[PDB]
PDB file of N, CA and C in Angstrom:
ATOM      1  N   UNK A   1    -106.343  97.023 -17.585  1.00 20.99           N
ATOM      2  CA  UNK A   1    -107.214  95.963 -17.085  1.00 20.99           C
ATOM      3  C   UNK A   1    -108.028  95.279 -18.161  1.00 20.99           C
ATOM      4  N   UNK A   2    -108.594  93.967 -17.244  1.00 21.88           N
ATOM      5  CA  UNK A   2    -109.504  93.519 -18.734  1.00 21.88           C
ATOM      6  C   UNK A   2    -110.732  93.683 -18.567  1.00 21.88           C
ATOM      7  N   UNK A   3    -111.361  93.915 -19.338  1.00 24.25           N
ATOM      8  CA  UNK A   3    -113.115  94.000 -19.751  1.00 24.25           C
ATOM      9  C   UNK A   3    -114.146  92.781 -19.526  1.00 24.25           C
ATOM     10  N   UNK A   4    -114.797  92.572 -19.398  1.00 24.40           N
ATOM     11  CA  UNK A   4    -115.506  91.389 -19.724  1.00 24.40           C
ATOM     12  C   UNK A   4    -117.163  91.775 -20.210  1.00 24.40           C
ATOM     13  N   UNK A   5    -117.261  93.022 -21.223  1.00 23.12           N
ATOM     14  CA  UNK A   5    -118.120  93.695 -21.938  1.00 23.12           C
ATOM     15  C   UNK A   5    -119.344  93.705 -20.797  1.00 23.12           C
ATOM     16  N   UNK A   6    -119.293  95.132 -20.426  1.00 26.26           N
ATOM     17  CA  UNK A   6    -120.995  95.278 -19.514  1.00 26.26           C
ATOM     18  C   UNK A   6    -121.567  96.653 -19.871  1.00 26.26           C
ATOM     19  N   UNK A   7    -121.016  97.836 -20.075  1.00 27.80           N
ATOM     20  CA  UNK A   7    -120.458  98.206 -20.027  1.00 27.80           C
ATOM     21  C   UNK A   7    -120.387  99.369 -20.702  1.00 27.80           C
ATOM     22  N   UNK A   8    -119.846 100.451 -20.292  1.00 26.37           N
ATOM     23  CA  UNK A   8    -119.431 101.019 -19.130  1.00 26.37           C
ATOM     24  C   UNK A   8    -120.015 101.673 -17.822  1.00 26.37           C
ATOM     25  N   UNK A   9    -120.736 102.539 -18.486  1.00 27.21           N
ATOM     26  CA  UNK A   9    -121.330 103.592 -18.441  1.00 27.21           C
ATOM     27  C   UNK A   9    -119.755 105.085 -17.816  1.00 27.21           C
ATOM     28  N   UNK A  10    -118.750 104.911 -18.715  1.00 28.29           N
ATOM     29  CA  UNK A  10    -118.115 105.817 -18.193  1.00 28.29           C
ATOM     30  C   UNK A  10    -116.682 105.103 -19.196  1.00 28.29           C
TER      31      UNK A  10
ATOM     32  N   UNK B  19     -85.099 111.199  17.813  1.00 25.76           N
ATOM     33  CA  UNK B  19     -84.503 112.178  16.493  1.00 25.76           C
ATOM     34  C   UNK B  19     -84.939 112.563  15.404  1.00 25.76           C
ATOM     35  N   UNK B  20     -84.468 113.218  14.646  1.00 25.79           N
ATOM     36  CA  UNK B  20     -85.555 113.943  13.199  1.00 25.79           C
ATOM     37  C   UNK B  20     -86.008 116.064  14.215  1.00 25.79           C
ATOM     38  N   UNK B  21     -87.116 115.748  13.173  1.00 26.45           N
ATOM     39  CA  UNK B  21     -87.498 117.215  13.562  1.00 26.45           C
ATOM     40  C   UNK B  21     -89.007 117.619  14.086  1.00 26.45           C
ATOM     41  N   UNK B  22     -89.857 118.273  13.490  1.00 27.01           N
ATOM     42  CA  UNK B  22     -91.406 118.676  13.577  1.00 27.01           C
ATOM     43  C   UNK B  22     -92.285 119.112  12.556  1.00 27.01           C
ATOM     44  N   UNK B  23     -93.513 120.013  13.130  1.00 27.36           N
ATOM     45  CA  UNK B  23     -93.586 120.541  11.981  1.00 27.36           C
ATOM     46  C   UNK B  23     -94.456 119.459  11.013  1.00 27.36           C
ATOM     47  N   UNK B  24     -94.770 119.577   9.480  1.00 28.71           N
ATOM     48  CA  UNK B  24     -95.924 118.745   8.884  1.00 28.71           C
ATOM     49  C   UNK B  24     -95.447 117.532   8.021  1.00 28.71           C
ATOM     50  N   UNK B  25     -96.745 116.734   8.671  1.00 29.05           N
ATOM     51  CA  UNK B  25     -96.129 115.496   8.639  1.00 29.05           C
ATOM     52  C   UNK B  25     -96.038 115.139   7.070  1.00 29.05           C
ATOM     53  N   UNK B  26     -95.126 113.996   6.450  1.00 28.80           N
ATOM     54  CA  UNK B  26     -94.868 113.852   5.302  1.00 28.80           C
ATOM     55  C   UNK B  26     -96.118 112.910   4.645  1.00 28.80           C
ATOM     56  N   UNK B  27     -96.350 113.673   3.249  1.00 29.93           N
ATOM     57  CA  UNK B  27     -97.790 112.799   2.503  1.00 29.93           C
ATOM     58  C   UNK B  27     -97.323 112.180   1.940  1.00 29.93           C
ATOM     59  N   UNK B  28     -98.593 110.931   1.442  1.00 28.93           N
ATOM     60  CA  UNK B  28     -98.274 110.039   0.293  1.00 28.93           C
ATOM     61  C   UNK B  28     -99.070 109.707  -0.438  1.00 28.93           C
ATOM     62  N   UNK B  29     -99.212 109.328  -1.683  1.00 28.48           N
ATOM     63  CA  UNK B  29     -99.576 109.625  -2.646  1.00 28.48           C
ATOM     64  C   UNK B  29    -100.178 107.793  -2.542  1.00 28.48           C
ATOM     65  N   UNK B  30    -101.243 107.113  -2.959  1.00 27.95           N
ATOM     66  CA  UNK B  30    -101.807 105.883  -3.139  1.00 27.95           C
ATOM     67  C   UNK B  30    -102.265 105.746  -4.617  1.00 27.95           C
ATOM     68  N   UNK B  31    -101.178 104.714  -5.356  1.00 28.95           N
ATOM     69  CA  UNK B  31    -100.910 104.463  -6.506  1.00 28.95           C
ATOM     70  C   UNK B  31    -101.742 103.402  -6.897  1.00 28.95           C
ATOM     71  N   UNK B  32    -102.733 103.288  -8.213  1.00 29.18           N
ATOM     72  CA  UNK B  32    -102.948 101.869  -8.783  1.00 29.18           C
ATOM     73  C   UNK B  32    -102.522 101.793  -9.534  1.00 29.18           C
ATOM     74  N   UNK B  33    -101.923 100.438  -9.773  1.00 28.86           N
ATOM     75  CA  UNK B  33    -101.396  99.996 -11.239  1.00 28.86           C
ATOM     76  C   UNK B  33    -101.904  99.053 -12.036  1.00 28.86           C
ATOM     77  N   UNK B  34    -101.688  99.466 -13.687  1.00 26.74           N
ATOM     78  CA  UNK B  34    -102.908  98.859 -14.670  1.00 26.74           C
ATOM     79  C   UNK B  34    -101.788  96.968 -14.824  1.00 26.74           C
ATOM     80  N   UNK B  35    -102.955  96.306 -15.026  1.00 28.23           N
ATOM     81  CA  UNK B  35    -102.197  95.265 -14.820  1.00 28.23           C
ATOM     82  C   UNK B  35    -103.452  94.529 -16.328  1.00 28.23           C
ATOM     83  N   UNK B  36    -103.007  93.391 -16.822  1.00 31.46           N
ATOM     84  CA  UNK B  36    -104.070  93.164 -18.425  1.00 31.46           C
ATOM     85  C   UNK B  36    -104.715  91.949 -17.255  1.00 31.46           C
ATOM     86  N   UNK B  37    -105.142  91.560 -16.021  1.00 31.15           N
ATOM     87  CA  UNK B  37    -105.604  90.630 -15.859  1.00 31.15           C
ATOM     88  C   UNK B  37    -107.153  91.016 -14.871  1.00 31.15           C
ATOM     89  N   UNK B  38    -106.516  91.898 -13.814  1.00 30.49           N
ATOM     90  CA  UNK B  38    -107.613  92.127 -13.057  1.00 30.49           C
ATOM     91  C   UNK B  38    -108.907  92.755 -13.791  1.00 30.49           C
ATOM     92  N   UNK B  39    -110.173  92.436 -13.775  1.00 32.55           N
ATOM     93  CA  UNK B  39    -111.149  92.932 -14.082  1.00 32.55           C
ATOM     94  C   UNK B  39    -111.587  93.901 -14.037  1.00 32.55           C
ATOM     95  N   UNK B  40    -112.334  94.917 -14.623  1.00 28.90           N
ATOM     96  CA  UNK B  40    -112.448  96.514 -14.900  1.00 28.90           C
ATOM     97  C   UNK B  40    -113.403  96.441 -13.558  1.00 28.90           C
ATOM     98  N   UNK B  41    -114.157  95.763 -13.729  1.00 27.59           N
ATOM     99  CA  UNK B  41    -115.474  95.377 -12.629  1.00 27.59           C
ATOM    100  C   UNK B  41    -114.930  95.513 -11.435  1.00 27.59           C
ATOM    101  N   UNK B  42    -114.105  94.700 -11.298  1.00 26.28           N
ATOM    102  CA  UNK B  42    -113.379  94.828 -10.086  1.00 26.28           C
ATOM    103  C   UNK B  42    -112.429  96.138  -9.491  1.00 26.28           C
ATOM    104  N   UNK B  43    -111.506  96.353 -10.378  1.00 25.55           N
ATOM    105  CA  UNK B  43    -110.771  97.577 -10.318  1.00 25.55           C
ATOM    106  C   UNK B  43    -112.101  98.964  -9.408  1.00 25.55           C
ATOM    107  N   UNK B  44    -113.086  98.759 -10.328  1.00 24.17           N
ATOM    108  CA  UNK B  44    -114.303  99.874  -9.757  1.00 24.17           C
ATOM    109  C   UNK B  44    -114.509  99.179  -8.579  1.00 24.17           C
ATOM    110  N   UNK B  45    -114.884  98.419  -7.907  1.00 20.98           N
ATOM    111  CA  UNK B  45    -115.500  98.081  -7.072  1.00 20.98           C
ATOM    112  C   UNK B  45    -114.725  98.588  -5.773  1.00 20.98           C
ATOM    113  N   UNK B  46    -112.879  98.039  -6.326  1.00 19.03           N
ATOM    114  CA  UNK B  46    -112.289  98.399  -5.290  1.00 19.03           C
ATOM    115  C   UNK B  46    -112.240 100.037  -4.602  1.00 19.03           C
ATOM    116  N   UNK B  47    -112.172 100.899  -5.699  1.00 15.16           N
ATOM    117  CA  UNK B  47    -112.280 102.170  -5.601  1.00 15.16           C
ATOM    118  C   UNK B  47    -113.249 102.345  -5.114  1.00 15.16           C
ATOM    119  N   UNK B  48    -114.465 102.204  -4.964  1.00 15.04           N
ATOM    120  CA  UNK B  48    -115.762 102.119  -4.087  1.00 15.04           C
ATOM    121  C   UNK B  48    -115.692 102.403  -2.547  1.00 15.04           C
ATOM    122  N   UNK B  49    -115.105 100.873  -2.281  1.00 13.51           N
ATOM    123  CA  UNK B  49    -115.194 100.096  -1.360  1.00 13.51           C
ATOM    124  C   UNK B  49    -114.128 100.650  -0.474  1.00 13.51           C
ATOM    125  N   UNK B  50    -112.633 101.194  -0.915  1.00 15.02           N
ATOM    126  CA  UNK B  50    -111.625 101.749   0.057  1.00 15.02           C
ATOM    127  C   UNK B  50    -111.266 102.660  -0.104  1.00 15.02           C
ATOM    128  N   UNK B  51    -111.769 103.565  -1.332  1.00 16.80           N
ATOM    129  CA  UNK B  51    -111.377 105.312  -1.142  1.00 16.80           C
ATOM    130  C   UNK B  51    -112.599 106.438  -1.565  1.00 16.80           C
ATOM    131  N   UNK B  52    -114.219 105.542  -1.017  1.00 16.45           N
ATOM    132  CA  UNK B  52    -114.877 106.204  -1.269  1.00 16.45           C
ATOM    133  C   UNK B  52    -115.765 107.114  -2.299  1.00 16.45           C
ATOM    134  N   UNK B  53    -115.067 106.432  -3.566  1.00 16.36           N
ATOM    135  CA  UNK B  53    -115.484 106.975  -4.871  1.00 16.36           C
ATOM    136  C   UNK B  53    -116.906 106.436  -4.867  1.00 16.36           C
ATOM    137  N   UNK B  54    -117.976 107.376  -5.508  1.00 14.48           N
ATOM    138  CA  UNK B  54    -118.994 106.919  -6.716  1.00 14.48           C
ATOM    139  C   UNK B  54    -118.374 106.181  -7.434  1.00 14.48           C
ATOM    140  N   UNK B  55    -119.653 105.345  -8.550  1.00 15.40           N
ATOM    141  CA  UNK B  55    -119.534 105.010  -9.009  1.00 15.40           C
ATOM    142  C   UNK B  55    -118.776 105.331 -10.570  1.00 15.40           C
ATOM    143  N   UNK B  56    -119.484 106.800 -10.912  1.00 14.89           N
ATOM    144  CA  UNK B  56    -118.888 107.546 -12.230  1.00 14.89           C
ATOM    145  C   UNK B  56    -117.001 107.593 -11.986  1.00 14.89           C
ATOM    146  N   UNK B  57    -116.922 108.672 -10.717  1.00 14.77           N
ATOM    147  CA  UNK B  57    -115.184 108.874 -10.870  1.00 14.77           C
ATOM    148  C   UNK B  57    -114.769 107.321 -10.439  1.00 14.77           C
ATOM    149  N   UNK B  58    -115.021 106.716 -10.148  1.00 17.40           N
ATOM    150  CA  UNK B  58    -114.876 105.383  -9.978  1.00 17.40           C
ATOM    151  C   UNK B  58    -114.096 105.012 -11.142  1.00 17.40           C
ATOM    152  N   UNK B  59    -115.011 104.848 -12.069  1.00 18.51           N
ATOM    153  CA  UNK B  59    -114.745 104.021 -13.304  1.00 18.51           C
ATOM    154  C   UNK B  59    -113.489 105.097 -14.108  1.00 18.51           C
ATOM    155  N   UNK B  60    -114.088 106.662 -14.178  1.00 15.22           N
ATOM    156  CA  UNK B  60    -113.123 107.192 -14.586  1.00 15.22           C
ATOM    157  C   UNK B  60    -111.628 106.781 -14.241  1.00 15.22           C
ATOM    158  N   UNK B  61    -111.909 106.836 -13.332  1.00 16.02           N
ATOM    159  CA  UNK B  61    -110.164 106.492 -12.576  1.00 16.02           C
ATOM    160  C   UNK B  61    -109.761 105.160 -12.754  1.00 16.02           C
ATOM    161  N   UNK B  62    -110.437 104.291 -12.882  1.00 12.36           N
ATOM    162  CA  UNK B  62    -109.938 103.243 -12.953  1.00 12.36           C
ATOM    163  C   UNK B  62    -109.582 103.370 -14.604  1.00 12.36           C
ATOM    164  N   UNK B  63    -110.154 104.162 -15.721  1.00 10.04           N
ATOM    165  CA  UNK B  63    -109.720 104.157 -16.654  1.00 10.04           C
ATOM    166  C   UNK B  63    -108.452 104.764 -17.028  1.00 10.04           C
ATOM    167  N   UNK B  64    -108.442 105.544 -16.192  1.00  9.21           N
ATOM    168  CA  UNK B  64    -106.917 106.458 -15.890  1.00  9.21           C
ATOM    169  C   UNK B  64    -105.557 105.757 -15.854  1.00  9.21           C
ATOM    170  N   UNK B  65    -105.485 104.826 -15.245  1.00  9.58           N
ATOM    171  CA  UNK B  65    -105.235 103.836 -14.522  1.00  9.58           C
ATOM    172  C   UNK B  65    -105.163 102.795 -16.176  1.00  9.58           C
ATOM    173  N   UNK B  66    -105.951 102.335 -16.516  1.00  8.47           N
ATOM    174  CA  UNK B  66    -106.335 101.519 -17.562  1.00  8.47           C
ATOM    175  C   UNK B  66    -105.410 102.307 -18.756  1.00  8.47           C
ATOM    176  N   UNK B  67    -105.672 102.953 -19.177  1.00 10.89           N
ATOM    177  CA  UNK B  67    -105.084 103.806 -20.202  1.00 10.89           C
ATOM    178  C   UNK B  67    -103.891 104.121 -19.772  1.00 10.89           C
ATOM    179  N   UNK B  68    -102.974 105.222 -18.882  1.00 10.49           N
ATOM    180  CA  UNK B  68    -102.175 105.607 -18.254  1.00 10.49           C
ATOM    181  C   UNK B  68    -100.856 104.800 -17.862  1.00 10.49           C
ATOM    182  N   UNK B  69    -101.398 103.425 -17.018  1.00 10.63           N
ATOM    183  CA  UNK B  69    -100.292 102.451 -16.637  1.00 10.63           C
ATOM    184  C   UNK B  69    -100.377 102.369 -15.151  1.00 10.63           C
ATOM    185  N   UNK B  70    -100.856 103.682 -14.678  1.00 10.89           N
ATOM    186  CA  UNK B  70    -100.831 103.978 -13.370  1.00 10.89           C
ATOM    187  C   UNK B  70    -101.510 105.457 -13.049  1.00 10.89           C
ATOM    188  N   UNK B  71    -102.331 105.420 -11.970  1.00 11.64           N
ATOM    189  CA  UNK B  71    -103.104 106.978 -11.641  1.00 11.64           C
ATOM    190  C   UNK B  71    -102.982 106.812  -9.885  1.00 11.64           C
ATOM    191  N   UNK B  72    -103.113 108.129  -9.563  1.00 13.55           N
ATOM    192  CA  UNK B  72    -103.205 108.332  -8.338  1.00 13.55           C
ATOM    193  C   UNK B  72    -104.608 108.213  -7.851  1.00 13.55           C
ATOM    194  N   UNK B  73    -104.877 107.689  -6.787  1.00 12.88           N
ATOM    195  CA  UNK B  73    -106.196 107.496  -5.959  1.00 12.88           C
ATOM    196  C   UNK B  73    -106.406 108.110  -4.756  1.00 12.88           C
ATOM    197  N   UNK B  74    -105.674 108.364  -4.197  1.00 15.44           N
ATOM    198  CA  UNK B  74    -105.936 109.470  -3.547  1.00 15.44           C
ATOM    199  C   UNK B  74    -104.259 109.993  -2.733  1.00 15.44           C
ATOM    200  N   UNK B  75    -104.488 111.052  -1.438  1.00 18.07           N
ATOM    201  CA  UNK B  75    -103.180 111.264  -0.868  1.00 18.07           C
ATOM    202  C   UNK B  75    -103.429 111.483   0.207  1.00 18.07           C
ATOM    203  N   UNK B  76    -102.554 110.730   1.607  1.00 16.53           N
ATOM    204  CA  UNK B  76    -103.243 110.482   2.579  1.00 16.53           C
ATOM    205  C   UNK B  76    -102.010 110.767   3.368  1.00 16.53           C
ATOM    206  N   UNK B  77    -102.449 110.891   5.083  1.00 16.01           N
ATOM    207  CA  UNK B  77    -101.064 110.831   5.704  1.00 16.01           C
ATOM    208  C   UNK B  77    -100.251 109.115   5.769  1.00 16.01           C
ATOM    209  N   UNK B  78     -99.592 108.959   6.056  1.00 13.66           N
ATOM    210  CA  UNK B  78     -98.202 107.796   5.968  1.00 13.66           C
ATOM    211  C   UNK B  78     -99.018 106.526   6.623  1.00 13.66           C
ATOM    212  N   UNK B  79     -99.840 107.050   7.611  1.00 13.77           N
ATOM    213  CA  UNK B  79    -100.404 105.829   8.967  1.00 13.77           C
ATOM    214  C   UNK B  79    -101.813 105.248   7.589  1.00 13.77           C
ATOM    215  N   UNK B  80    -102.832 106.431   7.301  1.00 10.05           N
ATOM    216  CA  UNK B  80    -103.714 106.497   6.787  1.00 10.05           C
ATOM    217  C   UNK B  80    -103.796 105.695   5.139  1.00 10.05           C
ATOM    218  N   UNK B  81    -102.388 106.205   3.912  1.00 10.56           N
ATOM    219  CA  UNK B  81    -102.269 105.408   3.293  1.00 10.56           C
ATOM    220  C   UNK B  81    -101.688 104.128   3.222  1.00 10.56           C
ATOM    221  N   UNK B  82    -101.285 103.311   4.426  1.00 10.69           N
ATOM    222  CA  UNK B  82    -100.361 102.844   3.958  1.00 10.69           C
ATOM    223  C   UNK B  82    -101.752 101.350   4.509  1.00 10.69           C
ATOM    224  N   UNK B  83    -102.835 101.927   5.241  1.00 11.58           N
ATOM    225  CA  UNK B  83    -103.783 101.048   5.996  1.00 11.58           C
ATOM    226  C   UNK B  83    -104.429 100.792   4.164  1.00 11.58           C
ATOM    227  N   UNK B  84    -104.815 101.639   3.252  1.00 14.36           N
ATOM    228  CA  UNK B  84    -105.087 101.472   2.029  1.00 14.36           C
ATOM    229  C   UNK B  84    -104.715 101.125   1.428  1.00 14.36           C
ATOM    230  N   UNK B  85    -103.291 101.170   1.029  1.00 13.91           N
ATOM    231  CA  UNK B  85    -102.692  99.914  -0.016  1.00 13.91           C
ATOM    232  C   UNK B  85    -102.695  98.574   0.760  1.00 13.91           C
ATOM    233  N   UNK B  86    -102.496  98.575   2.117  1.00 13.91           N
ATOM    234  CA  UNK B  86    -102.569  96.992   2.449  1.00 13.91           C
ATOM    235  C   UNK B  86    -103.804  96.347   2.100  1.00 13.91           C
ATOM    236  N   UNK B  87    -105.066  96.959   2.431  1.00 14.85           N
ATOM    237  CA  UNK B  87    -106.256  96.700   2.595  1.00 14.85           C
ATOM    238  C   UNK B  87    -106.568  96.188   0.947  1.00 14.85           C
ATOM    239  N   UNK B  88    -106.164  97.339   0.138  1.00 12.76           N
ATOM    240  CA  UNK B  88    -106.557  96.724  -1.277  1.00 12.76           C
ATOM    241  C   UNK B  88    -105.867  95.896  -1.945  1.00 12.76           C
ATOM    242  N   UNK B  89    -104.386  95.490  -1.644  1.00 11.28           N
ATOM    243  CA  UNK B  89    -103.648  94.123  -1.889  1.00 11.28           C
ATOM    244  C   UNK B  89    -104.448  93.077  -1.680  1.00 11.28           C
ATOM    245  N   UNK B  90    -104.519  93.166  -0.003  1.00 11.81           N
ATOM    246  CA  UNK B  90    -105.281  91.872   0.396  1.00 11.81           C
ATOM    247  C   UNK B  90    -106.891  91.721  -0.272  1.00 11.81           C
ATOM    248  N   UNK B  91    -107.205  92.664  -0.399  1.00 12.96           N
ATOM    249  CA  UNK B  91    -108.637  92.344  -0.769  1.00 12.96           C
ATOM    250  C   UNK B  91    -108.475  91.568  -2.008  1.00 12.96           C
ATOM    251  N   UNK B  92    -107.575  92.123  -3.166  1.00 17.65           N
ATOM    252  CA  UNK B  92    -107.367  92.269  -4.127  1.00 17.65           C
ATOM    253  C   UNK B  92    -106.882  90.475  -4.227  1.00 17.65           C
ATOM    254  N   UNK B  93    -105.957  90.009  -3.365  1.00 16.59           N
ATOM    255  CA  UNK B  93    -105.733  88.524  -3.664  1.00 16.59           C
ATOM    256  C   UNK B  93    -106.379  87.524  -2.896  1.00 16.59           C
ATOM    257  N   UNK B  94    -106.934  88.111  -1.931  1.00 16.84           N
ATOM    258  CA  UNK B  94    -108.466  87.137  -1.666  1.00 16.84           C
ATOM    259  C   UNK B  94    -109.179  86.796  -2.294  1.00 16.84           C
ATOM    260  N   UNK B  95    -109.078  87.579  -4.079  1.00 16.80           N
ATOM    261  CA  UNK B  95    -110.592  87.472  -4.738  1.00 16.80           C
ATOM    262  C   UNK B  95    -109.247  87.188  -6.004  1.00 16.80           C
ATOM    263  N   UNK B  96    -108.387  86.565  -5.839  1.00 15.98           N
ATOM    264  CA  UNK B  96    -107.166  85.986  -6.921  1.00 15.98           C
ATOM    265  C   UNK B  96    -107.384  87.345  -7.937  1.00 15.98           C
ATOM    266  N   UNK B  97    -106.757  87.972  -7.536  1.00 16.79           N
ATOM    267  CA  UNK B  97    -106.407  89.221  -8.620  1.00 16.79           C
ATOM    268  C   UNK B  97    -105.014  89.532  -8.390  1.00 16.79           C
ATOM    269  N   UNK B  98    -104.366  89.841  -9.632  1.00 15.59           N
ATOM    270  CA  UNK B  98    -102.601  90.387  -9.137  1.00 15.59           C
ATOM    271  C   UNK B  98    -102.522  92.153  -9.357  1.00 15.59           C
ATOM    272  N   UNK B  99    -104.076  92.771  -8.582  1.00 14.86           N
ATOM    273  CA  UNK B  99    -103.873  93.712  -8.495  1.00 14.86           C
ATOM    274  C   UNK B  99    -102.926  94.825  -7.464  1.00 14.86           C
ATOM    275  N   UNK B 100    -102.149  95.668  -8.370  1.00 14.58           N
ATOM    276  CA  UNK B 100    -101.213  96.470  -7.186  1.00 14.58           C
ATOM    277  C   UNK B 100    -101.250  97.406  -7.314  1.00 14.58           C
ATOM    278  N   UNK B 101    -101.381  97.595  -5.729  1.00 12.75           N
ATOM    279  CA  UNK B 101    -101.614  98.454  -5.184  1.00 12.75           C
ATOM    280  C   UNK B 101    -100.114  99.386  -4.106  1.00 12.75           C
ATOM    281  N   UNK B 102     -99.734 100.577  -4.094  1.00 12.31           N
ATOM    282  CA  UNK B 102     -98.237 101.428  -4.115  1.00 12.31           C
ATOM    283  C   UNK B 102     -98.526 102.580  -3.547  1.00 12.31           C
ATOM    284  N   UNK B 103     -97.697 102.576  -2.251  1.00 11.23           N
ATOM    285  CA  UNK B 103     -97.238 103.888  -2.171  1.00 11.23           C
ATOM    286  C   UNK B 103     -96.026 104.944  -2.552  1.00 11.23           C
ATOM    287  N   UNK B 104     -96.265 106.234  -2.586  1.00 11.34           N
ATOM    288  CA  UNK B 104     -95.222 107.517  -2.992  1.00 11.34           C
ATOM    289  C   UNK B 104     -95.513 108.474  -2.102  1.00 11.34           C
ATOM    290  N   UNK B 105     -94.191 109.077  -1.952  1.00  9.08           N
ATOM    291  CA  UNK B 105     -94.435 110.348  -1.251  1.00  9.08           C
ATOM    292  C   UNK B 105     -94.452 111.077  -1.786  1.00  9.08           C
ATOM    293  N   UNK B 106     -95.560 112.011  -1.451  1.00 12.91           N
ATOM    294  CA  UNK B 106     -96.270 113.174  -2.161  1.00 12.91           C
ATOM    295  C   UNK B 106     -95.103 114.202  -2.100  1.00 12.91           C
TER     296      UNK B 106
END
């Protein structure tokens, strides 16, 4: 999947 | 015809796809198989990394209401996320 940088916490 | 006896499982597949959103991927797991937020994300990383992870395993009537549910959700909100069943 894609990311869109938040992020993560995991 | 057929027989008795226990009924056959199945296994509810996600598959990693480079478009749908991580954000999303979690949300769905939330929203239709009950995860927190933590195994949430784990799994969706599973999934992310992997190619494909299992989400949960349900009877035939039970998963099959879950992959529909998260298709459709899934292209209501324009995602080409997929969602698969297997028998366990």
């Amino acid at each position: 999947f894609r990311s869109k940088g938040e992020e993560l916490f995991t | 015809r057929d027989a008795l006896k226990p009924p056959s499982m199945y296994k509810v597949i996600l598959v990693n796809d480079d478009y749908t959103p991580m954000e999303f991927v979690i949300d769905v797991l939330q929203k239709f198989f009950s995860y927190d937020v933590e195994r949430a994300t784990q799994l969706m990383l599973a999934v992310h990394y992997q190619g494909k992870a299992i989400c949960g395993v349900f009877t035939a009537e039970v998963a099959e209401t879950k992959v529909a549910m998260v298709n459709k959700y899934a292209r209501e909100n324009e995602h080409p996320l997929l969602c698969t069943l297997e028998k366990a």
